[PDB]
Amino acid sequence: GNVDLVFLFDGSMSLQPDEFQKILDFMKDVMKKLSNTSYQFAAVQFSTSYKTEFDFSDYVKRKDPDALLKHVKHMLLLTNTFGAINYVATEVFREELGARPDATKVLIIITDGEATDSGNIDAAKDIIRYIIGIGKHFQTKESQETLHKFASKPASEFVKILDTFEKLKDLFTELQKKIYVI
Amino acid sequence: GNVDLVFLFDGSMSLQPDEFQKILDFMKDVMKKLSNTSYQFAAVQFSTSYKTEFDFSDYVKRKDPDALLKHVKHMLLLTNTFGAINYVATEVFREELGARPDATKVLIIITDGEATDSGNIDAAKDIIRYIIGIGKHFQTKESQETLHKFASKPASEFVKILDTFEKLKDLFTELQKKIYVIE
Ligand SMILES: [Cl-]
Ligand SMILES: [Cl-]
Ligand SMILES: [Mn+2]
Numbered sequence A: 001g002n003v004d005l006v007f008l009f010d011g012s013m014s015l016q017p018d019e020f021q022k023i024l025d026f027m028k029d030v031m032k033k034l035s036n037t038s039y040q041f042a043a044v045q046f047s048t049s050y051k052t053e054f055d056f057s058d059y060v061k062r063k064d065p066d067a068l069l070k071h072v073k074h075m076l077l078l079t080n081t082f083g084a085i086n087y088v089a090t091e092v093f094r095e096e097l098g099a100r101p102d103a104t105k106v107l108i109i110i111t112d113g114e115a116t117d118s119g120n121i122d123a124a125k126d127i128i129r130y131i132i133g134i135g136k137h138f139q140t141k142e143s144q145e146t147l148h149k150f151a152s153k154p155a156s157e158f159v160k161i162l163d164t165f166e167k168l169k170d171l172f173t174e175l176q177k178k179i180y181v182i
Numbered sequence B: 001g002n003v004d005l006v007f008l009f010d011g012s013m014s015l016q017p018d019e020f021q022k023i024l025d026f027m028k029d030v031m032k033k034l035s036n037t038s039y040q041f042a043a044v045q046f047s048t049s050y051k052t053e054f055d056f057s058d059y060v061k062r063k064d065p066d067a068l069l070k071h072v073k074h075m076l077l078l079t080n081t082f083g084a085i086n087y088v089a090t091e092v093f094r095e096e097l098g099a100r101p102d103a104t105k106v107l108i109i110i111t112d113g114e115a116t117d118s119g120n121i122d123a124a125k126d127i128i129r130y131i132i133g134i135g136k137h138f139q140t141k142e143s144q145e146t147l148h149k150f151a152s153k154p155a156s157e158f159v160k161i162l163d164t165f166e167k168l169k170d171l172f173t174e175l176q177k178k179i180y181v182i183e
């Protein structure tokens, strides 16, 4: 059926220009591969606060990813992941913003550090959540574990730990192996 | 005889990751085709500032283009072309870094926008300079003309204007047609 997918991407101070761009490129990669399908997208940048870079309606209006993400400006602040996920659940997955009531909601969270806030993401639990943790800040098993609470279960399936930003291309190569005409 | 060639590549903010990658791929194709010859290479990324990604010595120690360029990080800043060329002439073409004294010096400058700086490139005049301007920013003849000052003469020979980054593939195809075993 229809799938409404939101890319919630980290725009923290830790990110170097090329790493940030690499996060954005993975997003573009997935979009252009899934162009003209039942998939519809929205992208939200999060750091201390949040910004819907383009919503579902924007996407359908002009499906071009490079264009849709042209005005993105790296926030360079903190990593308030709990608030960010809640913002997506209540402020992005909305009909007035182009979300289809029927669609399966999917969230792809991309981050390079532990959340700088706390609370709960109860309001977003019906959304299928994937989280990609990248870089040195996720060197230890402990840091990696902290991400499980944001993603769907099992974590072995929904949580992806990447050692480098370059590995995003690797991740894209693998996700494509899972594309099928059904 | 021996040829010391430096690729001076644009790492400005305008470039999309795949566009930057195409510039890198062109460089790798040229290097691979010219492996085990009298050519030795060095690569320098320029934007607001410069970074010798690998020097002649690095190339001699390890010829693998992929390995040599694997640590390149897109700068995503300005386009100080005058400063970059001067940097190549005075900080890259040096025996200290593997350059061969009486080798023919060649520079292949690749860019997608007009220079954000000014001055002169007198320090680099004895280097055979080629320049490839790519994309939307070189739509007008006026913009293409601003690149003449950086390249050797005639411009008809040293200045290449490409409308797309995909066109770098055709350029590689063209240059290969000029490859000969010189007697
Ligand atoms: Cl951070
Ligand atoms: Cl630029
Ligand atoms: Mn961070």
Ligand SMILES: [Mn+2]
Pocket: B010, B012, B013, B014, B015, B079, B112, B113
């Ligand atoms: Mn540029």
